[PDB]
Amino acid sequence: MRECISIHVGQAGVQIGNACWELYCLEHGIQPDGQMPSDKTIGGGDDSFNTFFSETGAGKHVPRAVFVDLEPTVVDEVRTGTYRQLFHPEQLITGKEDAANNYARGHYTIGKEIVDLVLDRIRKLADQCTGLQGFLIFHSFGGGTGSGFASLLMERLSVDYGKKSKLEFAIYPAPQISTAVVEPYNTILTTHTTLEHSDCAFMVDNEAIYDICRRNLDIERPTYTNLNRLIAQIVSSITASLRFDGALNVDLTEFQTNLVPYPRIHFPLATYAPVISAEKAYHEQLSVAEITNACFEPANQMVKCDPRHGKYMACCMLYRGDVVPKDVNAAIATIKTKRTIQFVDWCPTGFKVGINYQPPTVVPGGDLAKVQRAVCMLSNTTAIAEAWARLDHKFDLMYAKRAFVHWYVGEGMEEGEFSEAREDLAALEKDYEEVGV
Amino acid sequence: MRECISIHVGQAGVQIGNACWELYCLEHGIQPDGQMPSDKTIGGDDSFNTFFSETGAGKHVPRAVFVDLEPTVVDEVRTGTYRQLFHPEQLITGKEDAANNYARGHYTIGKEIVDLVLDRIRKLADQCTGLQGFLIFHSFGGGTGSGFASLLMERLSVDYGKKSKLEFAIYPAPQISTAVVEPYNTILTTHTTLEHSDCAFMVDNEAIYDICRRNLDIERPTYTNLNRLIAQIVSSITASLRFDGALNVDLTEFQTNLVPYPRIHFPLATYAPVISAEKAYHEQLSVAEITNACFEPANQMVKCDPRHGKYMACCMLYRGDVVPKDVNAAIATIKTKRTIQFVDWCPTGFKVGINYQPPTVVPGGDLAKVQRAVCMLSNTTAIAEAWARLDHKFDLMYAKRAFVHWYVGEGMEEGEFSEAREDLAALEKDYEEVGV
Amino acid sequence: MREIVHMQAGQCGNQIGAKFWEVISDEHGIDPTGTYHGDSDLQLERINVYYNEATGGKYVPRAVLVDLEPGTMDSVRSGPFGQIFRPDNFVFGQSGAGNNWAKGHYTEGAELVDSVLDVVRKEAESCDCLQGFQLTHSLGGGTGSGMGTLLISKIREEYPDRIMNTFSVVPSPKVSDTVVEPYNATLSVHQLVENTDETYCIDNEALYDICFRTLKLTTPTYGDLNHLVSATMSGVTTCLRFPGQLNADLRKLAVNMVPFPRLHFFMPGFAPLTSRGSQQYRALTVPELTQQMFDAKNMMAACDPRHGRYLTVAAIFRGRMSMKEVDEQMLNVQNKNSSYFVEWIPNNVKTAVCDIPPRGLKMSATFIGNSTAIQELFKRISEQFTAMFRRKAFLHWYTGEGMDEMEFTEAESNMNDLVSEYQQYQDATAE
Amino acid sequence: MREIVHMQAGQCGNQIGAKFWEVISDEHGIDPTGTYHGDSDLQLERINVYYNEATGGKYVPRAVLVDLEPGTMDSVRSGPFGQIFRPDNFVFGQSGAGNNWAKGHYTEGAELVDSVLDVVRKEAESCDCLQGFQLTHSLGGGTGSGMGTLLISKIREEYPDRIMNTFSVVPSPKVSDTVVEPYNATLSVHQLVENTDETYCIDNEALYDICFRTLKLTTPTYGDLNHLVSATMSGVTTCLRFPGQLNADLRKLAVNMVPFPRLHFFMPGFAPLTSRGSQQYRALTVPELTQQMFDAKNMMAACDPRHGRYLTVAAIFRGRMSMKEVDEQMLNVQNKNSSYFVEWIPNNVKTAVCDIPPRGLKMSATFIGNSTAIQELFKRISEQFTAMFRRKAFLHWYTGEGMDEMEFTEAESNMNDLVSEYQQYQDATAE
Amino acid sequence: LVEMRPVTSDVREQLFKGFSKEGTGRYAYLQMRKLKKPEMKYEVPLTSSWEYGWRLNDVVKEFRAPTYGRSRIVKDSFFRTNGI
Amino acid sequence: SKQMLPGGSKVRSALQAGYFDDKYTRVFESEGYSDAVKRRRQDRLKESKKNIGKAFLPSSGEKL
Amino acid sequence: LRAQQEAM
Ligand SMILES: Nc1nc2c(ncn2[C@@H]2O[C@H](COP(=O)(O)OP(=O)(O)OP(=O)(O)O)[C@@H](O)[C@H]2O)c(=O)[nH]1
Ligand SMILES: Nc1nc2c(ncn2[C@@H]2O[C@H](COP(=O)(O)OP(=O)(O)OP(=O)(O)O)[C@@H](O)[C@H]2O)c(=O)[nH]1
Ligand SMILES: Nc1nc2c(ncn2[C@@H]2O[C@H](COP(=O)(O)OP(=O)(O)O)[C@@H](O)[C@H]2O)c(=O)[nH]1
Ligand SMILES: Nc1nc2c(ncn2[C@@H]2O[C@H](COP(=O)(O)OP(=O)(O)O)[C@@H](O)[C@H]2O)c(=O)[nH]1
Ligand SMILES: [Mg+2]
Ligand SMILES: [Mg+2]
Fold first, then answer.
1. Which helix (H) or strand (E) holds D126?
2. Is C335 left (phi over 0), alpha (psi -120 to 50) or beta?
3. Which atom in ligand 3 lies closest to the alpha carbon of residue C169?
């Protein structure tokens, strides 16, 4: 019945989805060829796999996602390795050549050949549904396909489906770190589009992942594998209440009405706890109060912006494991009596709790320890207005002398759109300030 | 249930508290790997709850932070024999040593290292349900043990406030010295940990040296024996939280009863008997004479002569088979004795706490298994002589500006020397005006 | 299935292309005869970018060899690991350019243009993408300069939407080298300004000192120099061929390194580089590689970057590592040497990561940078140009072959105003 | 981790550093190949203070050997424990700086200064914490008085936060040593007192005295002298690399000594040194290591302490000290000969106990004295310096390579006001 | 020691046939190597994407359905296939 | 001259060399121990002043 | 190591 689809766009989106689907297969017991060691009969009257996997006649669980990218490779490793029989052949859509870090080339010329095919494929996917729950667009704000073709696909979904939930998982750029020069261009040029068509957009930052997985997991040389495994654990903690039952249940519908006070203000920060390693996991008891404090401390916030300067607006705690309701309630009481976590004055009640009974499935090959309790903290903190203003300042610095604009104006989009994008992000920043005060 | 948080700052403090944790592990039967193999006859006890916390299986993790800027003493702790006991991120190391410099410990390196230890103290306190004090081990010699200890005090007094804080400092000797900037660093650390400490509990190297020379009949041991003796002292201090019978005192007791005025919070220490196993065969250890051993002038943890100074409070903590009749008789004999003088506004200058649990002995130590022991905590005015000699050394130092260029170059300004000068001067006038 | 043709021009272009077609032949596992004999399907996946397949195991390289020297063409076709060339794409003249841009451009040039462009289109429908062209030649040469830049002009007007990697080698600015070095250099760079998307420039003097100071091996010779040339070849376009982590192809490098369409001349660098007797004494790690890239000895365009700033730079790390270290070091370079960069471009240092390391190295790094250091080379080329042009020395050759002083003066005006944009954007502040 | 980098200047510095690296590689159990042929794990826990890890189990010393004579590098390469050094760290010339400060500070020696700081900066940025820079040379020599002091000035300019500690061989009070030694020494120590943190002066005359009268050794040679010097290197640096009881590293020693910005010259001493004949007929205890410690016989460099006092004393003990006896004999000396001590500084003795002794010794004890008897060295150098400065004997050399009598006379002013402010604290009462 | 397993002779013979524009060489060889797990092909994760889902058949025990997964009882005890 | 110099592979400790923040921010500055039962008794003390009479005398037992 | 030995 309940079922959510995923759209993995670009290099970052496809690698994140690779980690995600590895985690889903090892959690639901589906072998990498797509076949369980059992079926609907002979034990296991189970339906938890139906959210992410579609079952055919002959015991094969094809996924319910689309790995789409404008470039070769990226999805070709999926097509030629490990999870290749499990994925459908015209489900891993590749283009001809990439946008190559260009909102223009992702949205306008190279975009309008793959968009019809991917729309037909997701239309077939929604045809094979008994009532959809929502979308999970795994992409990156960095550049090219993630800022471009992903936003074009999202506005196609907005004009097509309408009221369905259109959640984002976006790799926000860093204060001190970028990978492309034109990310201050592409991020603003894509947040001009995501703002009026999204429902909530989870922010993930790369060096924040670096810090949370080097201080706690204590790995001296982290990489994209650990990054994507941690993000896969976060998204499993989010969409675990559909697949598993128990206590307090939240789905993709209480998620929208509990993080979004105003239709522009839909950019939450994620937080996972515990991110402790196997060696350090012995000498510290995993309590609900201490994992709550580990969620609220700023060294575990998943975007580098300090929540001390700013106000928490709406917060959701997705507990997962052997969680009893009281120690959640008492932890919430302790942080509510504490004054340093300054909730905004117009939101007296601030938390929303979802408790799931299934313990978090450890990935054999990661660095996370097998913990009996976990918690995902999703906060609509106003501290990301600092990140928005910093991005606007970087855009001002680059656009002051028309640097890296000739590619955008010569691909096919107008040069004037940068002004509307800048004024839209200025409106977003002043809306954040007006709501925060 | 009721518990203390231990903060081990500097090399001396790390060694002292290492001996402390050895003694607590041997007292509670906790193995060095954290496991508790007590299953032969207990079947139900949590006397470790003051110092240890249960973390699954059979493992206990101690409430301790081992903070020192040089990464060698904590490193040999990490590679030593207590590797599995301590939590790996409790053992906090820096990169560069403060090097006998209050400005290094408090102004330059301290401002980036204090946040992680403050969050560790936060985690240790939040993992606690009946927390009632801090036990901080740091020498007054200087460097990490002075500047960072002062920083930790002035931030802990803001973070926790009314909770009791007790230092167990190594006070420098009148004649024995190691560092030459101790007359600077002692004054600098006292001027800051005057208004925030509740008790001070100094000990002295050459005093313990001479005590091990005479009583413990050993001529060439090392600092391991000093550390073990101070571990015995802290065991006698905190025995009345893990074991309570007869009269019992918690940390609030001998901090609100040792301190008459809120600047004279500088108690001494004494442990008796410190007698060795060979000598203690031909002895009759009794409460009628262990108090005489405590009040013998050449037996204190700091060799300031107690004959030329009255006593304000004389808090005794007895341990072992003690029946209060002879506490009463010994206090009567001591008060009737002429040489042990008391200040005219203290006919009630004795607070006694008796514990029935005998003092445990550590393997490899030199103290004997005595069925009776007592830790005496004085608040005498004999420490004013130590303050006067320390201020004399600081006056001869600062009189024409020797070793000041380091401090005034790396952060800490000129006026703090004069502020500490006038604060210790006012301290000496406080001792004199209160003693007269 | 993206496509790069590598169509070489000139004696220097032919030599560097032969080194290219052997250093990637043993990289993808192909013998001199043509049959694949490698030991990994990672080689076998994207061979199609460079090699047109035939029956059997033949993998003949898609390359329009353009030249005017029969001896040079014979040496290229008879060199080891280089007889894989198909007989179809062997267009070459017999008269020769004779170290003259105008002779290689107009007399021997334009008649050869028809046949050369026929071979280019014959290899252009025989593909799927045609992701880019790769023309390799020399500034100051005879055959590679005039014929080459005419080929950029023609291919740009007939396919005007694709990357043209002009991989050119400049000679040493001192001594004399060719007698018409500044003439050919000015004309060739003048065509490369408004007809080329992106251009790499290598200096022979810098090749000499990087092979002599860090590599040692007594005399630098030429083989090791062209081996670093082929290393930069195989390192720039390695995300297009071998898979891995975060990728960046020719278009991505062009959009991340060209702020303004005129200012697209780059300074390459290959920085695993150790001598014979110092390779056991050196631990190899990403901070060490980063130090070797940003060290100014490894710059092969001469042009000490300390006499200027850096507009943009890209580093292609080729070998598996941790990108934590890459991010650390690329940030630390900016954060400490922020004065020798541009403050109006935030985070002007770029990274790409491929997994497959090259032959015999644990990891490699290709360092290519758009900087203001090459304005010194351009202004000294213009100074030598006007010094030998005010007396009209060797003007008669160019006027006989079909050029004129108006062409000369507009070429040097273009060189001067490109120097002006470098100086202006070096001195330009943030706001 | 705390890490210091070694640099050797001249023949003197090169040979002293060679013996230093031999002694400490023997202590850390590293064979001349480079591997770890040791026994205990205490050797490989602080190996990074002196060594960089390489491929495999290979360790390379952090030494930046530099001079202008090829013969010193030839000798250290031909000798044992020379293959561990990195040949990239062999920047060297072929002339020699004429035993001249100006020739080592402004002439072609200053041209190689760019390369030697390039190597120094490479090592110091591959460093982790950069505890400091240690340099070995002679004050009256060639490159050591020249490029050595120029290295001092340049390094203290570019990293003015770390310790810059030098050892230096000072001239003998007798014989003649070098003819231009007063000029070289005056200019050198004028540079040393300006910028350095501390100096451990060595003198060949009293090294000969302690090698002939105390340590038997009818033929002292010079390797035994360098063995004693390397022993007092290892004794002072053992606190950074070996654990034990309470310890004082180089920053500890620099702050416990050096009361003023000036006056940072120390005269060291090694004190297990007893005759090979009486190593039977002498016990081993701290009450006699203390009298060998404070004996006027030991006194490694230059001066009789009886013509002065001890302003501050540091003693680094190595071995299993039951150090109550250590501190009681320090107090015992301090209150028995209080006349030979500064009264306005009480308790002026530092003790640093490490539990790891040097190989072949149960106990060792190294001296570091900021003695007030060091007046004689500066006084005799200033007297001789002005003696031929008023006579114009060989003063034309320094003016030829770039000096002048003006800078000569504020060098003499630095000497005489250093001696004056030294007297100001020598003849200062307690009250 | 070798990075790649010794592959069978038949696929090499299939690779050593005609060109790939019709497709009998590299194309058919890549199809026949695709139709095989990339775990009995190599011994080392030479590609970063390849360590995603490594040797699960030997690092993981027998797979099982999740303990607290949701059921389909309102479609099993409910609506039947055939009836009256 | 002064060449380009990058950083290094810092071995990792409680000091920050590798973190991309340059400073450690703490969530709790002046708030440490919580004392939940004591705080709850303070809420009882605050709430008990809002009564409208004396203490609620419950009832009486069996009057035999 | 094998490639290094092939080089020398
Ligand atoms: N967390 C995470 N981020 C990634 C990963 N791979 C790439 N990224 C992010 O992606 C950004 C680079 O832009 P891409 O998302 O690769 O752009 P693209 O989707 O490939 O589109 P084009 O640039 O046109 O090729 C970098 O800043 C990275 O932060 C990954 O595996 N994990
Ligand atoms: N009882 C005891 N005292 C010690 C020990 N180690 C050092 N001390 C005393 O500490 C005094 C000097 O202070 P230190 O502890 O050495 O300095 P620190 O606190 O470690 O600060 P740093 O030197 O900067 O690391 C000396 O005078 C010693 O008397 C020890 O192991 N046991
Ligand atoms: N890197 C490199 N440079 C070359 C080569 N051949 C010539 N040059 C440079 O080009 C100049 C001579 O050009 P030349 O080869 O005679 O041009 P051509 O007449 O077209 O063959 C010299 O100054 C050389 O520095 C080569 O094979 N490799
Ligand atoms: N280590 C060492 N020191 C020497 C040697 N010869 C002389 N010295 C010392 O160095 C001082 C003179 O330095 P000098 O040899 O002129 O320095 P150089 O010119 O740089 O080689 C004398 O006082 C000697 O004590 C030697 O072979 N080895
Ligand atoms: Mg891409
Ligand atoms: Mg210390």
1. helix D113-126
2. alpha
3. 1
